[PDB]
Amino acid sequence: SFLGPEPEDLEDLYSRYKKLQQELEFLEVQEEY
Amino acid sequence: MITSAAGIISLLDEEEPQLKEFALHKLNAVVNDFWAEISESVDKIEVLYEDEGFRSRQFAALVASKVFYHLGAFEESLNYALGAGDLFNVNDNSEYVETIIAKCIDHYTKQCVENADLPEGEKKPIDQRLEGIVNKMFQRCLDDHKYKQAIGIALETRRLDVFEKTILESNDVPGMLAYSLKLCMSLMQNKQFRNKVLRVLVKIYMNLEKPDFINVCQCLIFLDDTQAVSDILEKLVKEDNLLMAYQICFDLYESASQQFLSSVIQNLRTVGT
Amino acid sequence: PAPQDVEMKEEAAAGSGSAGEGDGKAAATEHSQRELDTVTLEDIKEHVRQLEKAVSGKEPRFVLRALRMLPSTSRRLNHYVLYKAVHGFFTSNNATRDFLLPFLEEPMDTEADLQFRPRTGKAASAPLLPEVEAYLQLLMVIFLMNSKRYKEAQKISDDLMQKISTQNRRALDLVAAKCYYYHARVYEFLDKLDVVRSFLHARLRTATLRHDADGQATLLNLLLRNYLHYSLYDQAEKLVSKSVFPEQANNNEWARYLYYTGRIKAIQLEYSEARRTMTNALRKAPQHTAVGFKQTVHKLLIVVELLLGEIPDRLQFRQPSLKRSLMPYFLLTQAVRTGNLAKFNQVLDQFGEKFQTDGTYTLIIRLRHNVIKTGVRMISLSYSRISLADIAQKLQLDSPEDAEFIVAKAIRDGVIEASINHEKGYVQSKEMIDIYSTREPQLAFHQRISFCLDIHNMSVKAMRFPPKSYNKDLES
Amino acid sequence: MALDGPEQMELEEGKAGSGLRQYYLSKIEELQLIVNDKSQNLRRLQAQRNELNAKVRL
Amino acid sequence: LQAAAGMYEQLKDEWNRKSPNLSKCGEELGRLKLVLLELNFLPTTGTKLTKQQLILARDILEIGAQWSILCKDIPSFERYMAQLKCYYFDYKEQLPESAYMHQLLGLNLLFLLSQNRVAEFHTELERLPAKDIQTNVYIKHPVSLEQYLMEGSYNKVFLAKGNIPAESYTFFIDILLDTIRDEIAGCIEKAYEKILFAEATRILFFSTPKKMTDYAKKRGWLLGPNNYYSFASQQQKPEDSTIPSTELARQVIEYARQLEMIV
Amino acid sequence: MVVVYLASLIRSVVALHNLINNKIANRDAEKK
């Protein structure tokens, strides 16, 4: 709901992991460059 | 205590239909210890899953899948499991066959990105068992009442199944738009999919009778669509609020150029004061 | 009371744990951590803590006061070490190591990375759970054969150790990789027909997708030993072939991997592959701490090199100061030199009690073939054409036929490398020389360089990694 | 995740829900993981390139 | 008939060392299977409690094994034999009993050897020891052979004379013997040039010059009534003479390219 | 490869224990 069940716990991890990937990609490119 | 498989392999080999059928029930527990020796006999267990003279297929598919992942072929292991369509409840509850479940989610994502891109559905290449897993994930979101987790999986998978009108299956309608714009531009480098997500937001604004005011303005400038700005203006006639109107219009102006400026004024008169 | 129990045991483990777990999740620091782990950590905990101010002591007070009360069998093994509800196989110290009085002295104080037991009662609020469970479990397993605990405690670190980390991330596997290893040295010691295998196998496959090479390595060692106990050749044969063995895992563990591999292969008459592993094994082991494993490896080593058709050096038996035990092994080498059966057969029996103990005895039966084989290859290599009659007398063979049959088994393999010409009855060696007017040397050199090459790229690469980990680590 | 060891019992928010939640996460997590291991190599390549770039440019 | 220990073993005794039959002791061996499903639902866990069920299990499969050996069919024997072994290993030889297990055991050893499955041979050697529980008469044949065969005294083997004493072993001994004869036969060609017929019967493990003519011919020596060892023999002796040059160099370009790239 | 590794082996204990004290110090130091 809006208390904090297990799916909210799902949303949190999802959000951070996704957002964080494009920035990690620039760093992955630097190794190659 | 027994450490050798040898007896089991012979039961499977023998001509007795009864012995062959029995073997699979006994096998599930051990085929994660004895498994190395059982690989020899991978062929007999596959025949029993194949052959419709048994309804031991379900049990057979599990044993046969189990030998395969151990062996180093993860894909064909999965493939047997999806075919019987053996329940995932059993695999989850065990710590042996964690392997297969892990491969199933990651296999699911490869199929889904290509299929999901333009059409609403996720198409035939993703069979009933994969969908069946996804459905379990789907229930959790609905319960939560929150669109953002639906949004988080839908971008990566590239689904439009749960990225559009998932408020008919119940999730949070307001607030949806902001999250969707900021993630999609940054993460995505596929234009075809990007455009879709943006086209969906034009439909989402309409559900609401006061949609978010920042979000319309991004769609207006990039797409060149008079349509994104238009739903918010349509709602405001019906609502009759000066305070509500002003914020949207100032947000729009900054982004907008002169070509946009001409086009909005016309829309606004049409809908009404 | 004893202030030594509290301050030394809780602090020493604390530094080590925090720094590794934190570092491992953050970045791949792995070369640096491995160097710390084998030499310092094991030595300090083992030797000095036995004689303190209380009886024994490895580090069971960091599994008692930054335990965190995990779902692990860290706590279960602890209860036996102290007294909480069961005395177990070892008695508690009332000189402030108590589990009967929990929440006694702590020098560590708060810091989440550091671990702390009254700060939190469960670690199940994060993905940290598998690595801290693995870490405490590690401390426990080393100590258990050391303080002569038996029965239940050994079996719940063989099946249940496996249960604790099977769902893992790279960091979690890396802490757990250690945990499995210190379990492996106790595991060789007691043989079971009980099948620990199931969990071990199923966890091996899921972790490879998850990441971490080190975890994969240790489970392969454990598993070879499982077959050894059962004494079934077939099952072990599958495991060696399938594996190549990667290089990320510490130096102590590699030595254990090579010794086990070498041992099993040789019985089949695969003396050739096995010798390479065993020679690497001796050399891979540590210094003084290693010594007890090293002697067993040194017994097997003479036998595998002897099996090839080589006659090992006499100084080698002499030099380690286990010379006495080495004395039958030297005699076996001498029996092989002369080619006489009579000395070889009598020695094998007399010393047989001592050989069985080492585990070497199975190989020693195969050595009978070598006694005559080494002698005929030596003589033929040296002087090419010798009559069949002459070889029969030297070895004490039955007949000129008896010799010809030795040559027949060998030739196809290539050992003796000669042929029997019954044109008059002699053995004639293949040998000729003047290879430098043929292209053949360019090949010999070509493979040597290719082999070296892959290592050169590796040399440059690995070298830089540990000083850089240390520069990245914060220092005072 | 609010755990990564074995615990709970199934419901599709139990062990089954938690175990499937972890796999949905693992594809996202893997990208995070390859880069932390990648950082060690990146600095190695960096130090050597900084010395080399300073000398050629000098 | 119907069989399973504690109430039957009639067929084991009726099969051989009484009269020859397998027309009751392997023809009726399809209904024994139905009790076997029960028995085999219990050595999932291998414990001393399981013993009672375990001996009945073995009993059909001992009669099963026995019919296959007499009948001269190796694959049927192999399925039957394999079960008995895992059913010994439940504290490692929990059941080393019966003298209608004795023969099987020896047979199993020679069987593994005929296939030239070396791994399996060693696995059995270690698993089995009931070679003095059931005592050295027919079981002695693979044992003698292991010692001799490892030593490389082919003369000593006691496999080219283990045909005469047999329970029904004679068959297994013969296939294994044929393997021994081949190994030597190819090698000898390389060994030396055109040697006497008599010399080429002696250490070729043959019985007559007639057996040698047919056997040699398939191998590629003595195609005619004159030895042809000479083709094969001459090839082996000079190892240091061969220059096709460019062909032998084996692509110098590739090795060079691997080497250059790093620098 | 040998030379660096020997320097590393003595440094290790020192460097790894100290890290935890410096880490804590850094977070607080950063704020001001």
What would you note in describing this structure?
This is part of a larger assembly, with chains A (33 residues), B (273 residues), C (476 residues), D (58 residues), E (263 residues) and F (32 residues). Chain A has 33 residues and is mainly α. Chain A has one helix at residues 6-32. Chain A is built from 1 helix and no strands. Chain B is built from 16 helices and no strands. In chain B, α14 runs parallel beside α16. Chain B is rod-shaped and about 85 Å long. Chain F has 1 helix and no strands. The longest helix of chain F has 30 residues, at 2-31. Chains in contact: A-B, A-D, B-C, B-D, B-E, C-D, C-E, C-F. At the C-E interface, α10, α18, α20, β2 and α21 of C face α6, α7, α8 and α13 of E. The PDB classes it as hydrolase. The entry lists the keywords UPS, Substrate processing state, Neuron degeneration, hydrolase.
Draw up the topology in text.
This is part of a larger assembly, with chains A (33 residues), B (273 residues), C (476 residues), D (58 residues), E (263 residues) and F (32 residues).
Chain B: H1 6-13, H2 17-30, H3 35-38, H4 42-50, H5 57-71, H6 74-84, H7 88-93, H8 99-116, H9 128-144, H10 147-157, H11 176-187, H12 191-207, H13 215-223, H14 227-239, H15 242-255, H16 258-271
Helix pairs in contact in B: 1-2, 2-5, 4-5, 5-6, 6-8, 10-11, 11-12, 12-14, 13-14, 13-15, 14-15, 14-16
Chain C: H1 3-26, H2 30-48, H3 74-81, H4 129-146, H5 152-155, H6 160-164, H7 170-189, H8 197-210, H9 214-230, H10 233-242, H11 251-265, H12 271-284, H13 291-308, H14 314-318, H15 323-338, H16 341-350, H17 352-358, H18 361-382, E1 385-387, H19 388-395, H20 400-413, E2 418-421, E3 426-429, H21 440-472
Antiparallel strand pairs in C: 1-3, 2-3
Helix pairs in contact in C: 1-2, 1-7, 3-4, 4-7, 7-9, 8-9, 9-10, 9-11, 11-12, 12-13, 13-15, 13-18, 15-16, 15-18, 16-18, 19-20
Chain D: H1 15-57
Modified residues (Phosphothreonine) (chain B): 273
Family (chain B): Belongs to the proteasome subunit S1 family.
Modified residues (N-acetylmethionine) (chain B): 1
C-alpha termini separation of chain C: 34 Å
Q: For the report, how would you describe the main beta sheet of chain C?
A: 3 strands, antiparallel
Q: Helical amount among residues of chain A, as a percent range?
A: over 70%
Q: Which strand-content bin applies to the residues of chain A?
A: under 5%
Largest interchain contact: C-E, 52 and 47 residues
Number of E-type strands of chain A: 0
Number of contiguous helices of chain C: 21
Cα distance spanning the termini of chain A: 46 Å
Strand count of chain C: 3
- What oligomeric arrangement do these chains adopt? part of a larger assembly
The helix/strand order of chain A is H
Look at the helices and sheets of chain C and give the structural class. Answer: mainly alpha
Described by strand count, sense and barrel closure, the largest sheet of chain A is: none
Apparent shape of chain A: rod-shaped
- Helix % of chain C is 55-70%
Strand content of chain C: under 5%
Radius of gyration of chain C equals 27 Å
Backbone CA Rg of chain A: 15 Å
Strand order, largest beta sheet of chain C = 1-3-2
Helices and strands of chain C, in order, run as HHHHHHHHHHHHHHHHHHEHHEEH
PDB class: hydrolase
Keywords: UPS, Substrate processing state, Neuron degeneration, hydrolase
Entry title: Substrate processing state 26S proteasome (SPS1)
Chain A: 26S proteasome regulatory subunit 6B
